[PDB]
């Protein structure tokens, strides 16, 4: 019934530095009047893609390159077993729109996501056309007719179906360009944050009369609000006509990661391996982000976490009652702060919440 | 009456500001003892007074327990007498002796250290009640002279 699935996460990290800019400063952001520490949507996405949870439950992430030479070498191995080389080379050339001659370096327009399965299927098609003495343009016309066939290859690589592809040069420009099923926001702190500075020393075992290096590093503890949206019809489309159950499956896997996954830097020196303290999931007709609950930057009372969850519940109550939303909602939390709006169904374990999303809000 | 007053910062910086600010609570004779100073809300103060203080816009009152005094001779009580000894007595012996002069007349001291005087004394009852009403020593309008009793 409802098309959008909203995922709200409240997660608190200990002192850390989870996103740096060119100056190795934390990534600041201002809301609505106060500095907040920010983790980029891109970091979140790649954290989830490159994650082991993903590899276990979704499959292979996509191959993102701007370098076509290396790509053609890879594809030559794998599909080299499956197809003729001349055919592979040509398939890459058509999709790319760039000329794949043996030369050391061949570069695409821009960094692009690739799926090997996809390319394999395209290779099948180019094999059929080449044997049948079909012209490239004619081939393009025929492939345009059934898009879904090209998109089921997406099922093999899902991150693309989630966050999308852009094309500028190839046959890819015509057929394989994809809108993201999932829209995600850079996570920000619920409260104001003034960044701490850690002053370090590198001690040189071979000089006694001093340190070998002196430096500074920005770092913060913070309670972050992560928000993400999955458009369901869009996800089904991008997979080539998959069912709501497959979609919801992917949606829960995303929920899990959204609650569980933390970007890698500089975790080896700061180790903010923190789990989500609050995970709330709602079905809706039109997407909704609860970030406005924290436009008034939350002031610490017994920590930032609790009054943040409080703020969240209260706002969601106001919004849901103001705009008369009646969508399926469930909330799982680690702390004993209870939700105000029934019906927000309370889940004792994340796995129960996840099973609830799979059953479509029951 | 025992009050728990907080004086605002702009009106408690100086000691005479403290005395005036606590004087202004009576639109209708008292003794005051400072618990904590220079908090963001100003001076945290325990206040003994003849009349009931009325909350000013500089000296807020948190509560007012009136008391009536039930003392028995022989009974052991903790005590904090914040006071000030002079003739300024720098020696420890001299301070303790001073205490046990006033209190020696009213009620024997069994233990004590230092000025805020913290200790245990044992008790004549009317003489002591009288002494608490009176206050003890110099600077009764400067924060000193307030003895508080506490039962064991």
């Amino acid at each position: 019934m409802s098309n959008f699935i909203n995922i709200h996460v409240l997660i608190s990290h200990s002192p850390s530095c989870l996103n740096r800019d060119d100056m190795n400063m934390q990534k600041d952001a201002i809301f609505g009047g106060k500095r907040r520490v920010r983790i980029s949507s891109q970091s979140l996405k790649r954290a989830m893609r490159k994650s082991g949870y993903y590899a276990q439950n979704i499959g292979e992430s996509s191959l993102r390159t701007i370098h076509l030479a290396q790509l053609r070498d890879v594809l030559r191995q794998k599909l080299g077993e499956r197809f003729d080389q001349k055919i592979i080379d040509k398939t890459l050339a058509l999709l790319s729109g760039k000329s794949v001659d043996e030369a050391e370096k061949i570069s695409a327009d821009a960094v692009t996501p690739w799926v090997v399965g996809e390319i394999a299927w395209f290779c099948e098609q180019v094999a059929k056309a080449e044997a049948d003495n079909l012209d490239d343009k004619k081939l393009l016309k025929v492939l345009k007719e059934d898009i879904a066939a090209i998109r089921v290859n997406l099922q093999q690589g899902v991150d693309i179906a989630l966050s999308g592809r852009m094309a500028t040069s190839g046959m890819m420009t015509e057929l394989g360009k994809v809108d993201g099923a999932m829209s995600i926001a850079h996570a920000i702190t619920t409260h104001q944050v003034d960044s701490d500075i850690d002053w370090f020393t590198a001690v040189d075992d071979l000089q006694e009369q001093g340190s070998a290096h002196l430096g500074t590093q920005e770092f913060s503890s913070g309670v972050f609000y992560r928000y993400a949206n999955i458009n369901l019809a869009q996800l089904q489309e991008n997979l080539g006509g998959a069912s709501r159950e497959q979609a919801l499956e992917i949606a829960t896997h995303v929920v899990h990661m959204l609650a569980t996954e933390v970007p890698g830097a500089k975790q080896r020196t700061y180790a903010a391996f923190n789990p989500a303290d609050m995970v709330m999931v709602n079905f809706s007709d039109m997407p909704l982000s609860m970030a406005n609950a924290f436009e008034k930057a939350v002031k610490a009372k017994d920590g930032f976490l609790q009054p943040s969850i409080q703020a969240f519940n209260q706002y969601w109550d106001r919004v849901a009652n103001g705009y008369g939303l009646n969508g399926a909602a469930a909330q799982f939390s680690l702390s004993d702060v209870d939700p105000i709006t029934a019906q927000v169904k309370q889940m004792p374990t994340l796995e129960q919440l996840k099973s609830w999303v799979r059953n479509n809000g029951e | 009456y025992l009050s728990k007053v907080i004086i605002a910062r702009a009106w408690s910086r100086d000691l005479y500001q403290l005395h005036q600010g606590l004087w202004h609570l009576f639109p209708n004779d008292f003794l005051f003892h400072v618990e904590k100073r220079n908090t963001p809300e100003g001076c945290h103060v325990l206040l003994q007074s003849a009349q009931m203080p009325v909350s000013t816009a500089v000296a807020t009152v948190i509560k007012t327990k009136q008391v009536e005094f039930q003392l028995q001779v022989g009974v052991p009580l903790y005590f904090r007498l914040r006071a000030n000894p002079i003739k300024p007595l720098i020696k420890e012996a001299e301070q303790i002796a001073w205490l046990q002069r006033k209190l020696g007349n009213a009620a024997r001291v069994e233990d004590v250290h230092p000025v805020c005087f913290e200790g245990v004394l044992t008790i004549d009852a009317p003489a002591l009640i009288d002494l608490v009403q009176q206050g003890i020593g110099p600077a009764k309008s400067m924060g000193c002279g307030l003895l508080s009793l506490a039962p064991l």
């Binding site: 100056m23 400063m25 600041d28 500095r35 003034d194 960044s195 500075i197 500074t216 | -």
Partner: protein, 150 residues
């Protein structure tokens, strides 16, 4: 009715070790408001008037890098001297420019400590009072330029 920067400099130089050191201890610039020696030092120079005091705060905090790291001589800018040191790397100056308010004063003081810089004090002083909008950009410009002549 400006702040006589050189007068302040000499006053800082003339302080007793107890007060010079007492102020040197301050970690962040606003903590200067807790020291009486601060009030005493600033007092001739007009700290009594609001929107004189933020400037005075920054100026003193930069002097408190100690002990005499700021050495006075068209004029010589702070950016210039930071380059003339050659100890300081561009990236650090960048962090200074990019830095939020109190942190920026702190990192600056840290730089001063590191550079043992040879500036034109009242120039840098002025620059410090209006700090900083153009001033940040201006110091970047001066630093990169001086650093590139070399």
């Amino acid at each position: 009715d400006e702040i006589d920067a050189m007068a302040l400099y000499r006053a800082w130089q003339q302080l007793d070790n107890g007060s010079c050191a007492q102020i040197r201890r301050v970690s962040e610039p606003d903590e200067l408001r807790d020291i009486p020696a601060f009030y005493r030092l600033v007092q001739p120079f007009g700290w009594e008037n609001p929107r004189h005091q933020q400037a005075l705060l920054r100026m003193v905090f930069c002097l408190s890098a100690g002990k005499n790291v700021i050495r006075h001589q068209t004029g010589i800018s702070l950016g210039r001297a930071l380059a003339n040191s050659g100890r300081i790397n561009e990236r650090r100056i960048f962090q200074l420019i990019r830095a939020d308010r109190t942190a920026d004063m702190v990192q600056l003081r840290r730089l001063l400590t590191h550079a043992e810089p040879v500036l034109d004090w009242p120039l840098m002083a002025r620059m410090l009072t209006w700090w900083g909008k153009r001033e940040r950009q201006q110091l970047l410009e001066d630093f990169v330029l001086t650093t590139n002549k070399n």
